Design a protein around this ligand. Structure first.
Ligand code: ZN
Lengths: 325, 82, 216, 122, 218
RNA sequence: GACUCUGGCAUGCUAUUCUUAGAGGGACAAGUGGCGUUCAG
């Protein structure tokens, strides 16, 4: 029963179900959220720190490079996986486990990758979010050793091996379906959903592909046979000359190019929270905007803002009197 | 630059661009004089001789010095056919 | 390569190009780069003709070898992808490396601590490193660049068509440039493989430091 | 009398900050290693730097050993800078290749490649 | 005492570069005035075209400064033009002299009729443009002199042009635009291509590539 | 004069142990003993 950072981040009160509670020091020291760090100073101390000897770390590394998840995991993820492997070897027999995992089989459908299936609130034709379902809607819910991991890539390699995994729920998980990003230039898959440039060839070419992993150790990938996905419509357009200085914003062609620092002021990037106990004392219902700073005059916007504007193809017609920032 | 006596009355002769045959001026600081090493045809090592190409600043501004140098290299047998 | 059989691109070079991903261009395309290309596949990725890549790489190697003092060649990267490779390239040949931020006025402002006067410029990206290219246009500097499909050929004299976005491709192209310069110079035999492996030129990416030092 | 200049001091400071390992007790070995490490054009200030690094290493050796211990990341940054694996990452057994890339290789006379695997777009 | 910084300055300080025209041959930027003071030296004469005061607007108030237009010229050869604004009139004058030495350009001299003796006039009619000011220089027969307004007369006499016809257009009342336009035309004398310069150019070695073994030593 | 250049000795390279004139060496407080804030001297 090893605990990842996702157990403490999601406030898993699961010290009672397990007895071999083992954690690394780097999984507990890298957490920056104040609430769970306060929780760790209050929680009963039955966990104990344990460091793995590196032969298990070596072996976890060579099949991490074979399962296709080595760029997806981090080093502390490798440490946690080696920790649960070495305890499964120490307490349980090792011969239960198969190495050199199986081949993935391909089964594609006509569904778009952006179809909103497996979202709790959405319902096609009943699917209701009720007060009795809030604690249960986490993910697809399904003896002595276990894991408390929410990251998918560790689960993918772990069920490729064959260790039983559990979550902050009680009963163990047999099936794990999720999404990965696949490059259609170099065919390298990433489990990091946040990134937009692939690690191998560096192009902005990752596309969503769904994956399902069984407890037996079978990975299978659903592609989309939809021509809308692989359509080169708004991909070629004239780019301006590269410009430098303190105010230039380049069209973001690579993952590691140096942008000038253009940050919003702290008054600009405060959103009002309405459930604060001292909110009603305020003179206004909303946070006052920023109209006086230099970042307001330079029309600096948040990174998450204006996403659908970027998704329109540049070789199209905007409205006559507008300018796209 | 040459009178009736035959004396060459001129301060200097400016070089011309290899791509557009324009005179490279005295204050044309975007002009390029590139030396390209030519190699022995058996061992493929630097022989010691070289081909010299001059490209004026206007062609280099136009973005066309690349194709200019490439076609001059095909002309001089440095870059092979296709 | 003047149709020389010794200078032709071999099988293992093609294998390294395909493994790194050098043939994969961008989805955008500048019209001056349309000479160096094979076709656009249906996904939108432009495919770079590797024979033209080899020819322009050999032309750039010929340009570099033709300079008597190897320190007069300046080799510049700003983004992390090329950084280590540039340093390794210097250790291969003796060129002057500028890795990190390029201070503006390095070639024009004669009253400066970092002022220098190169004879050749070899650069990683014309988009990221636009400032040394403009600066080179001020000071009569010829320029060699590693160009992608979406790269401006403004003030570029020899453009090498390659994938300059991925780390392995950038490192591989720098490694083969150093290899061909040292082979034309005569310090390495062409018949034997180089003992310097291209993994030395790659971006090293500190979480890969921790992942590799853990498994060591 | 005689006094040391600032340029020799700062160059010697950079030299001791970088390559403390190579320096030794004899003077002329310090002179030759300082000659082959960095670019110094003139002989006289090079000899001045050699004398000054000899003086400061005699001063550091007398100092209790702990300055030397904290010089540990320099070599790791160096060994990391020059790390290579045992097997090349570009030497892959099977590499996936587009059909159009396969046509390009066929037209460019590399049709007899064996490590290639053509994956059709699904 | 001159301690050069550029490679060109170090070569000029030594006996490697014999004439200034070599620097003109390879279109190299001249960044040190001591190169010009080394090659031309005592032959250079300088005429202050204009001293005029301005009141620069600062937050402490309007402070008086002086702007100097200075043309410098090697007769029978070279001219430069310089503009400098400074606190003191002497500082502005010497800054304009330095800036005009940095901008020394050579001028082409030709013949009007038959080619007997030294060249005296421009080879063809050339045009320089600066801020709506157009200055046109036309070849003139020997002995006519410079038929122009006083400011391009000063620059053309300093160029070694013995005789020339001139035609100006635009707001000639602004002196800087007028001087810059006539400077532009007398630079376009070597920017122009004639059937004299039709032979293929043999490329020599640049000073940086010829004296590299001397330049590695310093 | 804590500025710049620089000499003594070369049986060394260059057309060369006796005359030459270019380059390369060689000297840097380098070493030792005392006085010294144990560091500047
Ligand atoms: Zn990719």
């Amino acid at each position: 029963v090893v605990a990842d950072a996702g157990a403490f981040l999601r406030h898993a009160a699961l010290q009672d179900i397990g007895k071999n509670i083992y954690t690394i020091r780097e999984v507990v020291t890298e957490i920056r959220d104040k609430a769970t760090r306060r929780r760790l100073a209050v929680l009963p101390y039955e966990l104990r720190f344990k460091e793995p000897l590196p032969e298990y770390v070596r072996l976890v590394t060579e099949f991490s490079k074979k399962t296709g998840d080595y760029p997806s995991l981090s080093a502390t993820d490798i440490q946690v996986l080696a920790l649960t492997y070495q305890l499964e070897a120490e307490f349980v027999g090792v011969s239960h486990l198969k190495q050199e995992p199986q081949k993935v089989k391909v089964s594609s459908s006509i569904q778009h990758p952006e179809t909103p299936l497996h979202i709790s609130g959405f319902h096609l034709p009943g699917g209701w979010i009720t007060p009795s379902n809030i604690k249960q809607i986490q993910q697809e819910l399904e003896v002595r050793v276990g894991c408390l991991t929410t990251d998918f890539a560790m689960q993918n390699v772990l069920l490729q091996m064959g260790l039983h995994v559990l979550a902050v729920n009680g009963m163990l998980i047999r099936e794990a379906r999720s999404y990965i990003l696949r490059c259609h230039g170099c065919f390298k898959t990433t489990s990091d959903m946040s990134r937009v440039f692939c690690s191998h060839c560096g192009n902005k070419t990752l596309k969503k592909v769904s994956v399902t992993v069984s407890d037996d150790g079978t990975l299978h990938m659903h592609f989309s046979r939809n021509p809308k996905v692989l359509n080169p419509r708004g991909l070629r357009y004239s780019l301006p000359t590269p410009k430098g200085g303190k105010y230039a914003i380049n069209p973001h062609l690579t993952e590691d190019q140096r942008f000038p620092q253009l940050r919003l002021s702290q008054k600009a990037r405060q959103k009002t929270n309405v459930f604060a106990p001292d909110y009603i004392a305020g003179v206004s219902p909303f946070v006052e905007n920023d109209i006086s700073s230099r970042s307001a005059t330079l029309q600096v916007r948040d990174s998450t803002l204006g996403a659908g504007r970027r998704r329109l193809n540049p070789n199209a017609s905007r409205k006559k009197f507008v300018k796209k920032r | 630059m040459q009178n009736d006596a035959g004396e060459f009355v001129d301060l200097y002769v400016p070089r011309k661009c290899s791509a557009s045959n324009r005179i490279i001026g005295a204050k044309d600081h975007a002009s390029i004089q590139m030396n390209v090493a030519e190699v022995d045809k058996v061992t493929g090592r630097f022989n010691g001789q070289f081909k010299t190409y001059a490209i004026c600043g206007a062609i280099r501004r136009m973005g066309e010095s690349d194709d200019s140098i490439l076609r001059l290299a095909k002309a001089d047998g440095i870059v092979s056919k296709n | 390569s003047g149709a020389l059989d010794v200078l032709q691109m071999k099988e293992e070079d093609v294998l390294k190009f395909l493994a790194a991903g050098t043939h994969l261009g961008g989805t955008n395309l500048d019209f001056q780069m349309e000479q160096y290309i094979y076709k656009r596949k249906s996904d939108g990725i432009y495919i770079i003709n590797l024979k033209r890549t080899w020819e322009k790489l050999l032309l750039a190697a010929r340009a570099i070898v033709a300079i008597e003092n190897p320190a007069d060649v300046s080799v510049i990267s700003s983004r992390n992808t090329g950084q280590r490779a540039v340093l390794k390239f210097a250790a291969a040949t003796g060129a002057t490396p500028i890795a990190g931020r390029f201070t503006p006025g390095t070639f024009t402002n004669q009253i400066q601590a970092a002022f220098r006067e190169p004879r050749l410029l070899v650069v990683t990206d014309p988009r990221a490193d636009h400032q040394p290219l403009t600066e080179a246009s001020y000071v009569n500097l010829p320029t060699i660049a590693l160009c992608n499909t979406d790269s401006p050929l403004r003030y570029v004299d020899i453009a090498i068509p390659c994938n300059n976005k991925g780390a392995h491709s950038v490192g591989l192209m720098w490694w083969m440039l150093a290899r061909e310069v040292l082979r034309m110079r005569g310090t390495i035999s062409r018949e034997h493989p180089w003992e310097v492996m291209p993994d030395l030129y790659f971006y090293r990416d500190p979480e890969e430091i921790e992942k590799e030092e853990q498994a060591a | 009398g005689r006094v040391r200049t600032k340029t020799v001091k700062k160059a010697a400071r950079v030299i001791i900050e970088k390559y403390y390992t190579r320096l030794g007790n004899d003077f002329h070995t310090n002179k030759r290693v300082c000659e082959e490490i960095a670019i110094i054009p003139s002989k006289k200030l090079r000899n001045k730097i050699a004398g000054y690094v000899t003086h400061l290493m005699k001063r550091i050796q007398r100092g209790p050993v702990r300055g030397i211990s904290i010089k540990l990341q320099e070599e790791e940054r160096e060994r990391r800078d020059n790390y290579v694996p045992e097997v090349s990452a570009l030497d892959q057994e099977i590499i996936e290749v587009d059909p159009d890339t396969k046509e390009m290789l066929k037209l460019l006379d590399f049709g007899s490649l064996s490590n290639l695997q053509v994956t059709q777009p699904t | 005492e001159w301690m050069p910084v550029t490679k060109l300055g170090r070569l000029v300080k030594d006996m490697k570069i014999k004439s200034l025209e070599e620097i003109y041959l390879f279109s190299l930027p001249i960044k040190e005035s001591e190169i010009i003071d080394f090659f031309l030296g005592a032959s250079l004469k300088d005429e202050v075209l204009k001293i005029m005061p301005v009141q620069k607007q600062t937050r402490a108030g309007q402070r008086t400064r002086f702007k100097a237009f200075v043309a410098i010229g090697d007769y029978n050869g070279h001219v430069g033009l310089g503009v400098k604004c400074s606190k003191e009139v002497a500082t502005a004058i010497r800054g304009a002299i330095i800036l005009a030495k940095l901008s020394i350009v050579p001028v082409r001299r030709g013949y009007w009729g038959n080619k007997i003796g030294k060249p005296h006039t421009v080879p063809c009619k050339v045009t320089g443009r600066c801020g709506s000011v157009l200055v046109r220089l036309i070849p003139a027969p020997r002995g006519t002199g410079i038929v122009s307004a006083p400011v391009p007369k000063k620059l053309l006499m300093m160029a070694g042009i013995d005789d020339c016809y001139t035609s100006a257009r635009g707001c000639t009342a602004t002196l800087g635009n007028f001087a810059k336009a006539t400077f532009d035309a007398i630079s376009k004398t070597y920017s122009y291509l004639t059937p004299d310069l039709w032979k293929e150019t043999v490329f020599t070695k640049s000073p940086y590539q010829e004296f590299t073994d001397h330049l590695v030593k310093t």
